[PDB]
């Protein structure tokens, strides 16, 4: 009868393969609604 969650218990002296690699996952999504996340030039005359 096991408790699911187990702790990383990070330490600063471990390897580069056991050290906290923060992660961010960006998903871009497209519905039948007005898209608004549009993410981005000089003037001359005569």
């Amino acid at each position, epitope marked *: 009868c096991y408790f699911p969650l*187990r702790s990383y218990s990070f330490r600063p002296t471990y390897g580069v393969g056991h050290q906290p690699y923060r992660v961010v996952v960006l998903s871009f999504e497209l519905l039948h609604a007005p898209a608004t996340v549009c993410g981005p030039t000089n003037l001359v005359k005569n």
Partner: antibody
Amino acid sequence: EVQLVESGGGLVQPGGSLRLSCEASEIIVNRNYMNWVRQAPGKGLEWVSIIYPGGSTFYADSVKGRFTISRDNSKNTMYLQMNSLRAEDTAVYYCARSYGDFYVDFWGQGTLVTVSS
Amino acid sequence: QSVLTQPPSVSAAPGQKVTISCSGSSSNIGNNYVSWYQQLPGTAPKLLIYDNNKRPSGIPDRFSGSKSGTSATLGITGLQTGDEADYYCGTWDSSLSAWVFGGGTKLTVL
């Protein structure tokens, strides 16, 4: 009492096919991470295959592709489909429960396997 | 190429502490957890030490396990006759994505 008992071991010709089986009591094979490990006479336990709760399988390098691990729907028993044998598959296969990926808590008694004519 | 290396044999007389060293590349034993198994003759491996130091389910005491850098050490105060078996060290090599075991020591009591 907890126990895992395995059958299906005997003489077989090179290139044959077997269905070894792991029967689980007191425990439920469709949940605990189950493992097939081997040891040729005079040799060292070598990881053959691990079955995850969610159905995912992992196999070693030497034992890739030819083999297959499977988890019964209702019989509370797991099976190894050994196919395309060679000389280096002479073994005493064991099935063992492994908390996560950390340590192998329970080991079955042992089922000889021989590849010769 | 990662497969932990273990001395072919270790021997001591009763009353003398026995030390076994399992060494491997820091790909698997420097980033994951060692565990130590005992195989009595003609039987099946019995878990002995898990999670780098612990001793499960009331194993006979004086059995100790430690981890130093890229190595692991098992220790038995004295060399009792009943402890004669093969000893293996296992870690989950993520590079190979596979359990990797040591060579195995033939502990003989002098």
